[PDB]
Amino acid sequence: SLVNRKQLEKMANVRFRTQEDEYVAILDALEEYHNMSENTVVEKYLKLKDINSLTDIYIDTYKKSGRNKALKKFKEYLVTEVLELKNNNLTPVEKNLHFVWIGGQINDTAINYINQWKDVNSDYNVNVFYDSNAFLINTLKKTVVESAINDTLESFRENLNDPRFDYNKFFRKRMEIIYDKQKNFINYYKAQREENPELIIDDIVKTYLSNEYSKEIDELNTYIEESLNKITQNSGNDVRNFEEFKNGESFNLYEQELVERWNLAAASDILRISALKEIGGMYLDVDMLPGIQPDLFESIEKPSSVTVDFWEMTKLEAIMKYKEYIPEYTSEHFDMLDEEVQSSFESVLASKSDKSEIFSSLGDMEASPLEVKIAFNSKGIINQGLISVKDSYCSNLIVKQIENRYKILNNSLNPAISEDNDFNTTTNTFIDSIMAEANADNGRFMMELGKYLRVGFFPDVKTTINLSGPEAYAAAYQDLLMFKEGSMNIHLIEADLRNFEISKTNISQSTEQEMASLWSFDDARAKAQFEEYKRNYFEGS
Numbered sequence: 001s002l003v004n005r006k007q008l009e010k011m012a013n014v015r016f017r018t019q020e021d022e023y024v025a026i027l028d029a030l031e032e033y034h035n036m037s038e039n040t041v042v043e044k045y046l047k048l049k050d051i052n053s054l055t056d057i058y059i060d061t062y063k064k065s066g067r068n069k070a071l072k073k074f075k076e077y078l079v080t081e082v083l084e085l086k087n088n089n090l091t092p093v094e095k096n097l098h099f100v101w102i103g104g105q106i107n108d109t110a111i112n113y114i115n116q117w118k119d120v121n122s123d124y125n126v127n128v129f130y131d132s133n134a135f136l137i138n139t140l141k142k143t144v145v146e147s148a149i150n151d152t153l154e155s156f157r158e159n160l161n162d163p164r165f166d167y168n169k170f171f172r173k174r175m176e177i178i179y180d181k182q183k184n185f186i187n188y189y190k191a192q193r194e195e196n197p198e199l200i201i202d203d204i205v206k207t208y209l210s211n212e213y214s215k216e217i218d219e220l221n222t223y224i225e226e227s228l229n230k231i232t233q234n235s236g237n238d239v240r241n242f243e244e245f246k247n248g249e250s251f252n253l254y255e256q257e258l259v260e261r262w263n264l265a266a267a268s269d270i271l272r273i274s275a276l277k278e279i280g281g282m283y284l285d286v287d288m289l290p291g292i293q294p295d296l297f298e299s300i301e302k303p304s305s306v307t308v309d310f311w312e313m314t315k316l317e318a319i320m321k322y323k324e325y326i327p328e329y330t331s332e333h334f335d336m337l338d339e340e341v342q343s344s345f346e347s348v349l350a351s352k353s354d355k356s357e358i359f360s361s362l363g364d365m366e367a368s369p370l371e372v373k374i375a376f377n378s379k380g381i382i383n384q385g386l387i388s389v390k391d392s393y394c395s396n397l398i399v400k401q402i403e404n405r406y407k408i409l410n411n412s413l414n415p416a417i418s419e420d421n422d423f424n425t426t427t428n429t430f431i432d433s434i435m436a437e438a439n440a441d442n443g444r445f446m447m448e449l450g451k452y453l454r455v456g457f458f459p460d461v462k463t464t465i466n467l468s469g470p471e472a473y474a475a476a477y478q479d480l481l482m483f484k485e486g487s488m489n490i491h492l493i494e495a496d497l498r499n500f501e502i503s504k505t506n507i508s509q510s511t512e513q514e515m516a517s518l519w520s521f522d523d524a525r526a527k528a529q530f531e532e533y534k535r536n537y538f539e540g541s
C-alpha cells in the first residue's frame with residue numbers, strides 16, 4: 001500500500017540533479033520495509049520511524065531541493081501507512097478489568113458499580129488495586145482540611161455575615177493553612193523515613209495523627225483491618241506485590257501523589273497505565289458502568305428539548321428505577337420527562353427479564369500492538385476508560401510522557417519548596433521558575449503546572465489532566481504519528497484521535513457518580529461547601 005522504491009524515484013528527480021547518499025538511504029530503508037514479512041507490527045513501525053528520520057535528514061540538508069515536495073508527500077504517506085498498520089493487524093486483548101481504589105476503605109457504591117461489570121463479563125478476571133500500606137491517606141487529608149476549615153472560620157468568626165467574606169476569600173485563606181499543615185506532615189514523613197527507611201506509610205500517618213490531632217491508634221488500626229478485609233472480599237490486588245511497578249521509575253511519582261499531595265486520582269493515573277503495560281486488558285474508573293444494549297431504547301425518540309447528555313443519564317436512571325440493579329440511584333433527570341416518554345421507558349424495560357438484555361458484554365476484544373484505546377466524551381478524550389494489549393507501544397510512550405512531565409514539574413517545584421517559605425512565597429518562586437522555562441512548544445502545559453500546589457484544595461484546579469491525564473495520552477498519540485518522542489504541543493485534531501477511541505457501546509459514562517469529582521470541584525460546589533461549613537461552625541459541629 002505504501003509506495004515502493006521505484007514508485008518514489010519517480011516522485012523525486014529532475015534528471016539534472018544527482019542522487020545523494022542521504023537520498024539512497026531513504027531508498028534502501030523503503031526497500032527493506034517492503035521485505036519485512038518475517039517481522040512484527042512494532043518492528044514495522046520502527047522501520048517506518050527510521051524511514052521518516054532519514055527523509056527529514058534529506059529535507060533539512062537540501063533545503064530548497066526539488067525533491068522536497070515529493071518527499072513531503074512521502075511523509076504523509078508514512079503516517080497513512082502507520083494507521084493502516086494499526087487497523088489491519090489486531091491481536092486479542094487480555095480479559096482483565098482493572099479498577100483502582102487507593103487511600104482508604106472502598107465504598108459500597110464503587111463495589112455496586114463494579115459488580116455490574118462482573119455480572120455481565122463472567123469470562124473476565126477482575127482486579128481492584130489497593131495499597132495495603134496506605135489505607136489512611138484519605139483520613140489524613142480529611143483531618144487536615146477540616147482542621148483548616150475550622151481555623152479559617154475562627155479567624156473570621158465575626159465577619160460571617162460580611163458579604164466581603166466570599167467563598168473565594170475563604171478558600172484562599174484556607175489554602176494558606178492547608179499548605180502549612182501539609183508541609184508539617186511531609187517533613188515529619190521524610191524524617192521518619194530517614195531514621196527508618198522501611199516504615200510503611202500507614203505507621204507514620206497514624207503516629208502523626210495521634211501526636212498532632214489526638215486520634216486513637218487503636219481505632220485507626222481497626223479501620224485498617226476492616227478496609228483490608230473488605231477489599232480482600234472484593235477482588236483486591238495489592239500494589240505492594242505489583243513488583244514491576246514498585247521497581248520502576250514511576251513509583252516515586254505514584255508515592256509523590258499518594259503521600260505528599262494526597263491526590264489519589266493522580267496516583268491512580270500513574271498506576272493504571274503501568275497495569276496496562278505489564279498485564280494488558282481494560283482499565284475502568286469505579287464510577288463507570290457497562291454499555292447499554294444498542295437496540296434497547298431504539299424505539300424511544302429523544303425529545304427535541306433535551307441534550308444528548310441529559311438523555312444518556314436518563315437512560316441509565318430509567319434502567320435503575322425499573323430494575324433497581326443499584327440501590328438509591330437518582331431519578332432526577334428521568335423524572336423531568338413527559339409522562340408519555342417515561343411510560344415508553346417503562347414499557348420497553350417491562351419487556352425484558354434478564355440483565356443480559358439491558359447491559360451488553362465485552363466479549364472477545366482485539367486491538368493493535370501499537371495502540372492504547374481511550375474513552376471520550378463531549379469534552380474530548382478521557383482516560384476513565386482504557387483498552388490495551390500487554391506492553392503495547394503506546395503504553396510505553398504514555399509512561400514516558402508522564403515521566404518527562406513530572407521531570408519538568410519537579411525541576412522547578414523542588415527548589416522552590418526547599419526554601420522553607422509560606423504558601424504565597426513558595427507559589428511565587430515556583431511560578432517564576434516555570435515561566436522562565438516556558439516557550440512556544442510548552443506554554444499551555446506550563447501554565448497549568450503553575451497551579452499544582454492547589455490541586456484538590458481550591459476550585460477549578462485541573463493540573464492532573466495535563467500531568468498524568470488525557471493530555472499525556474494525546475501527546476503519546478502525536479509521538480506515534482510524528483515518529484518521535486516527547487511532544488509537548490498537541491496539534492492533532494479530533495479526527496486524528498478518533499482512530500484511538502473506544503466505541504461508545506462499550507461503556508456507559510453518564511453515570512450518577514461521574515457527576516461528582518473526587519479530586520476536583522467547581523465554583524458552585526465550592527460555594528455550597530462554604531455556606532455549609534459556616535453553618536456547621538455556628539452550630540459547633
Ligand SMILES: O=c1ccn([C@@H]2O[C@H](COP(=O)(O)OP(=O)(O)O[C@H]3O[C@H](CO)[C@@H](O)[C@H](O)[C@H]3F)[C@@H](O)[C@H]2O)c(=O)[nH]1
Pocket residue numbers: 099100101102103104138264265266268269284285286287382383384464465468469470514516517518519
Ligand atoms: O480516594 C480516592 C479517590 C479517587 N481514586 C481514584 O481516582 C479515580 C478517578 O475519580 P473520578 O471520576 O473522580 O475522576 P474524574 O473526575 O473523572 O477525573 C478525570 O481526570 C483524572 C485525572 O486525569 C483521572 O484521574 C480520571 O480518571 C478522569 F476521568 C477513581 O476511579 C479512582 O481510581 C482513588 O483511588 N481513591
